[PDB]
Design a protein around this nucleic acid. Structure first.
Lengths: 63, 11, 94, 63, 213, 125, 290, 230, 51
RNA sequence: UUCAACGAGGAAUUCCUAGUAAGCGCAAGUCAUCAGCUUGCGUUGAUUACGUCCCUGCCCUUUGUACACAC
């Protein structure tokens, strides 16, 4: 399965996420203008790259 | 119990 | 900086000594005929040498590489480096 | 934060909402600074993706 | 052409220094054997978290990496492997034993697969770290999992953890020791053979995330 | 009568005094050579002040280190600190300042704990 | 400068300057059969009568590096590749040799079958690294291209007697011993060109020397179950030049390799249970200023 | 052309446990078993539907859920199945009170019921049971969750009645050469078949009829025997 | 697969100890526990009435 | 030869964020306490959080006041 890479541009704050899971807003690398909201598990900061097995799915909250 | 942002999104 | 002095010999070899302690630091060997002009940047970063075989050598100074070498059309007799604008003038043999 | 959580598809339909609401000039003028604050933060935050969208419908919408 | 003279007398010392030791002043190799140049991180998003750009002489940099958040993303990954190797109640504190068995396992990684063992362990990290995982979305305790993505520091953390504890359980009561089981684990994880504990665990975590995505 | 220089290297309770003076090039820790410093896996932790800057700096000076206190790894960290800042102080006082701060730049680019220890701790959160 | 002798259930590395056992490998369960060094001389493979190839590193008998579990039959010959470093060829009493990658030591990377009875020897061809010549007790030196299927030889050389050893002299010609003679085979033309039968009983083993300090530029020596080890010169038509007689039937022999640079050895191990080594050996500063 | 093995004398199969996470096997998990003990004053018993009128109602619970007989008759079926003799199975059970018990293949579970009751009392209170020959330890309470003990490559399905019905033979030859199969079967008298939602990715069934517990076990075992040629 | 029989006692009781088949080592363990509890209770009581 | 325990300890539960957890020994025995031990002292020294109020709780405020600008 072809995988894609996406750089964090903004760690979303004050979302009501479940603890240990943080929403994040990533823009792609093959077209560095379009973004998608993902939600990651470990510690994340800005401008680091993370690996999306799919990109056809926006993230809701977790709670 | 939603919050701001998702209430605005569903609206 | 006042730390380095540069000697250009008639057998074409630049030697770089320390002005405080008086010992050889480096030794560049590009030219084969007499080196008539040596100068260095105002930031000690690129040096420029000109010999009377008519090649101007451009070296990096911190790294000991050469950045390039330009062959003119006459043997060069004198260099003057204007150091703020980074422009040096050569009195050629023609 | 409420305007930063929402993705770009919701930003595009937010622009559709603003485009419809400034035809009804009654509730445009009773909510002018709120519409201005929200709309300018939305496109200021999403400016990089908005100027990479290619659709004359949205171009005429913004105008 | 052009050549620089920068030493002007052959350097000899009164204390005799071994020839390979004074050969080590032209390039820093790990244990004076394994070169750090041409060691790339063949998976992006993990470059800037597996650190191979400051070469070291031994995996015992006593620097302080646990007082800011992502400061352990620039501990050299050989030393992160070593520190993760020295953990259980039996082997706590014994960093010199951990460094010595890391030296032995890089020697036997190279003698089995005749390539750079730092490149082998870097490929093992970037193949082991899972790229997706599940959190348990609670609902008070409704047993349903939701697939999340996973950040690269967590991928390097869980990569080193999976590799080291896989080497422990693979050395638990067999004839092989921790150095030989870790060598087998790092080789199999580097090529990605699905015979290793580590990438079988990665495939299970990624498959469960694909399931309840 | 001789140009000489004394520095100190410390980790937890080990402490190492290094005397550097002009000489033939011999580096001696506790009387024995530097190539005998056990635990023999950190001998390159002791060596890296030499290999970071070249042995042509040590070709004209002789160092001696006296190390007391501490344990094995605290003693090798005291030795490497004493050697590093002793070479820097010798090139400050008796060789030129350009080689002095070239040595400081090389050691600080490798790790500044060759030159400055981490000394007073903890933090009361 | 060191050599490994495979007796029963131990392998002893002797030194070529003291001729005493420097190191020994005794943790085999049954009779160890073959023991050879890798081409880098860094590790040592030993095939054992239980079909367990165990490769240690040389000069460290305590670290068994990996134990390939080959066939349930006894594994009788184990040698690394001479060009490649990470492949090990083991033939066994299963009438099938196997090429193992020593990284993936679970399944054999290639399974060279095709021989009808008791494959006892491998050999590699010394310039083409894809070319494995194997020899069995039915005669019939098979040889395999490893890029192909590998279950069929590309051709077969009919030594009529059951072969005991096959070595490779040139990149082109190989020598097979078995029965009272040995034959040499051109390999580019699939064709026999010399045969010497100067023994009474079966030639057990061969080995070959090149470029060493000698009047003979090449030398093939042959060991033959009747006491004799003889040296044949490959440049004048494999004529015999010298020989030794020993106190019993000689089962295996070897000499020091081509670059020995010191005390040079000929070793022959007998079926009687003993080992025979024959070696050839090799004022004031004021006054000086005056 | 292919030779024989070097030894035709048949070895016993290697008995597998949780200390071997490599070998392909069949794990059978008896979920929601009713294994609780209780005091009489002087005596300890295992809670039945029949040893009491209202000990279970004094404890609060209902009497229909105290059925250790059905996990007994599942354990008998699994350990007399030929796949257990061939050594391709091990039996984990987990009590409705959240107690995980590992069951060795080498055990001889007693055939009558109250012998099994007296076995379960000592297992639940001593956490371990040795053999009469006392050389190994063959019935033991181990630590939750079960995924710490299951093999690292193991597809975990659960058994029910309302699910897309499969055939066990082609279902087991679908999975590959090192993947095991962990089959959560419920040992309840009745209940929702959701006892293992957090471990399982596939919820399947075997028939179109209301299938008893040990009949479901024996059906899956016989399908596995046909798929693995036993 | 070999098949061992499980060793367990019938009418198990955890609160009672196991029935050792020796009446002169189970007896010494019983009376060691008895002297320990009676000695502990005895000297506890005499030090608290001393207090 | 064959008749007790036991091969890292279940359910639950407690504590813990850098010279920290843990390993290791060596001394002392300081008017209370402690030797069925207590307190010092060094040696070796990590993994993972360093975010969040989603859960469990605890707390605070609900005129902005305190002086501009802004909200």
């Amino acid at each position: 399965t072809p995988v894609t890479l996406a750089k964090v541009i903004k760690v979303l704050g004050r979302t009501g996420s479940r603890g240990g899971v943080t929403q994040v807003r990533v823009e792609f690398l093959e077209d560095t203008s379009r973004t998608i909201v993902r939600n990651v598990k470990g510690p994340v900061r800005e401008n680091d790259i993370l690996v999306l097995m799919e990109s056809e799915r926006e993230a809701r909250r977790l709670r | 119990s939603l919050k701001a942002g998702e209430r605005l999104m569903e609206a | 900086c006042g730390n380095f002095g540069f000697i250009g010999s008639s057998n074409g070899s630049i030697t770089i000594y320390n002005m405080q302690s008086g010992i050889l630091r480096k030794k560049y060997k590009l030219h084969k005929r007499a080196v008539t002009g040596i100068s260095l940047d105002g930031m000690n970063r690129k040096m420029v040498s000109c010999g009377l075989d008519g090649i101007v050598g451009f070296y990096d100074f911190n790294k000991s590489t050469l950045l390039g070498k330009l062959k003119l059309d006459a043997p060069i007799t004198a260099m003057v480096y204007h150091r703020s604008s980074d422009l040096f003038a050569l009195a050629l043999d023609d | 934060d409420a305007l930063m959580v929402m993705p770009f598809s919701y930003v595009l339909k937010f622009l559709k909402f603003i485009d419809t609401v400034m035809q009804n000039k009654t509730l445009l003028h009773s909510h002018l600074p709120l519409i201005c604050k929200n709309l300018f933060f939305i496109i200021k935050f999403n400016h990089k993706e908005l100027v990479s969208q290619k659709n004359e419908e949205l171009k005429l919408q913004i105008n | 052409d052009f050549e620089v003279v920068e030493e002007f007398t052959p350097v000899v010392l009164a204390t005799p220094i071994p020839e390979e030791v004074q050969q080590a002043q032209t390039e820093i190799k790990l244990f004076n054997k394994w070169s750090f140049e041409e060691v790339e991180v063949k998976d992006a998003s993990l470059v800037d978290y597996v650190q191979v750009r400051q070469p070291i002489f031994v995996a015992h940099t006593a620097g302080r990496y646990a007082n800011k958040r992502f400061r352990k993303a620039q501990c050299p990954i050989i030393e992160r492997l070593t520190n993760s190797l020295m953990m259980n109640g039996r082997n706590n504190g014994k960093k010199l034993k951990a460094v010595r068995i890391i030296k032995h396992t890089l020697d036997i990684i190279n003698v089995l697969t005749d390539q750079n063992p730092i490149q082998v362990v870097v490929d093992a990290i970037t193949n082991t770290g899972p790229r997706e995982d599940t959190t348990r979305v609670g609902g008070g305790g409704a047993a349903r999992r939701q697939a999340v993505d996973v950040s690269p520091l967590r991928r390097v953390n869980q990569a080193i953890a999976l590799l080291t504890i896989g080497a422990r359980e693979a050395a638990f009561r067999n004839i092989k020791t921790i150095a030989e089981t870790l060598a087998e684990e790092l080789i199999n994880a580097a090529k990605g053979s699905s015979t290793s504990y580590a990438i079988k665990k990665k495939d299970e975590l990624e498959r469960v995330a694909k399931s309840n995505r | 009568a001789v140009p000489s220089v004394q520095t100190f290297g410390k980790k937890k309770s080990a402490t190492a005094v290094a005397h550097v003076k002009a000489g033939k090039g011999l580096i001696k820790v506790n009387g024995s050579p530097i190539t005998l410093v056990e635990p023999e896996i950190l001998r390159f932790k002791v060596y890296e002040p030499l290999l970071l800057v070249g042995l042509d700096k040590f070709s004209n000076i002789d160092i001696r280190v006296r190390v007391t206190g501490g344990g094995h790894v605290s003693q090798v960290y005291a030795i490497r600190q004493a050697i590093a800042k002793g070479l820097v102080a010798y090139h400050q006082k008796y060789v030129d300042e350009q080689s002095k701060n070239e040595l400081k730049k090389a050691f600080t680019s490798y790790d500044r704990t060759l030159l400055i220890a981490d000394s007073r701790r903890p933090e009361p959160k | 400068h060191d050599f490994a002798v495979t007796s029963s259930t131990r392998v002893q590395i002797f030194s070529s300057r003291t001729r005493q056992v420097i190191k020994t490998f005794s943790r085999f369960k049954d009779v160890v059969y073959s023991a050879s060094f890798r081409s880098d001389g860094k590790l040592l493979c030993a095939g054992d009568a239980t079909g367990l190839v165990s490769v240690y590193d040389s000069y460290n008998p305590r670290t068994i590096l990996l134990s390939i579990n080959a066939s349930t039959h006894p594994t009788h010959v184990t040698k690394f590749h001479t060009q490649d470093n990470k492949i090990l060829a083991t033939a066994s009493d299963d009438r099938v040799t196997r090429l193992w990658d020593i990284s993936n030591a679970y399944e054999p990377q290639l399974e060279l079958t095709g021989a009808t009875d008791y494959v006892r020897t491998l050999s590699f061809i010394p310039a083409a690294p894809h070319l494995v010549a194997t020899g069995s007790y039915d005669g019939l030196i098979r040889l395999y291209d490893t890029r192909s299927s590998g279950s069929t030889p590309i051709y077969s050389l009919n030594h009529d007697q059951p072969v005991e050893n096959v070595i490779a002299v040139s990149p082109t010609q190989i020598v097979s011993c078995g029965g009272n003679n040995f034959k040499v085979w051109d390999l580019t033309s699939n064709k026999k060109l010399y045969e010497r039968g100067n023994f009474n009983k079966a030639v057990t083993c061969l080995d070959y020397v090149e470029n060493f300090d000698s009047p003979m530029q090449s030398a093939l020596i042959a060991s033959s179950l009747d006491g004799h080890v003889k040296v044949f010169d490959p440049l004048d038509n494999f004529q015999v030049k010298f020989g030794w007689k020993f106190s019993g039937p000689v089962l295996s022999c070897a000499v020091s390799p081509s670059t020995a640079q010191g005390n040079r050895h000929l070793v022959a191990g007998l079926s009687s249970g003993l080992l025979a080594i024959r070696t050839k050996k090799k004022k004031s500063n004021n006054f000086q200023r005056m | 052309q292919k030779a024989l093995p070097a030894s035709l004398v048949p070895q016993a199969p290697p008995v597998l446990t949780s200390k071997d996470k490599i070998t392909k096997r069949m794990i059978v998990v008896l979920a929601m078993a009713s294994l609780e003990t209780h005091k009489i004053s002087d005596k300890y018993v295992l809670l039945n539907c029949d040893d009491h009128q209202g000990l279970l109602k004094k404890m609060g619970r209902d009497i229909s859920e105290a059925r250790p007989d059905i996990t007994h008759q599942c354990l008998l079926t699994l350990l007399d199945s030929p796949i257990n003799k061939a050594g391709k199975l091990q039996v984990y059970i987990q009590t409705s009170r959240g107690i995980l018990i590992e069951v060795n293949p080498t055990v001889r579970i007693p055939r009558t019921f109250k012998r099994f009751s007296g076995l379960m009392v000592q297992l639940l209170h001593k956490l371990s049971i040795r053999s009469v020959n006392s050389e190994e330890k063959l019935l033991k309470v181990i630590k939750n969750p079960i995924t710490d003990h299951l093999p690292t490559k193991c597809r975990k399905v659960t058994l029910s009645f309302d699910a897309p019905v499969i055939r066990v033979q082609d279902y087991i030859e679908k999975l590959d050469d090192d993947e095991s199969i962990c089959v959560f079967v419920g040992a309840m008298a009745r209940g929702k078949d959701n006892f293992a939602d957090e471990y399982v990715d596939e919820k399947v069934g075997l028939s179109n009829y209301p299938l008893s517990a040990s009949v479901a076990c024996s059906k899956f075992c016989h399908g596995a025997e046909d798929a693995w040629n036993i | 697969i070999p098949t061992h029989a499980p060793k367990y006692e019938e009418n198990f009781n955890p609160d009672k100890k196991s029935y050792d088949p020796d009446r002169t080592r189970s007896e010494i363990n019983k009376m060691k526990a008895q002297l320990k509890k009676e000695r502990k209770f005895t000297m506890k009581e005499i030090r608290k009435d001393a207090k």
